[PDB]
Symmetry: C2
Subunit: 28 residues, 2 copies
């Protein structure tokens, strides 16, 4: 059941990538 | 097995909170 954790540890990384935009947008 | 996903969707949120610091640090 490594597929479950694999995605788990992956989501976080993606989630951290989306916010990186929210930041740059602070100067919209 | 709701505990697994519960943490999954939670990690992302936490992960997104840690980076929020990395940003503010850009002006270290």
């Amino acid at each position: 059941k490594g597929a479950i954790i694999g995605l788990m540890v992956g989501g976080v990384v993606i989630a951290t990538m989306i916010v990186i935009t929210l930041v740059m947008l602070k100067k919209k």
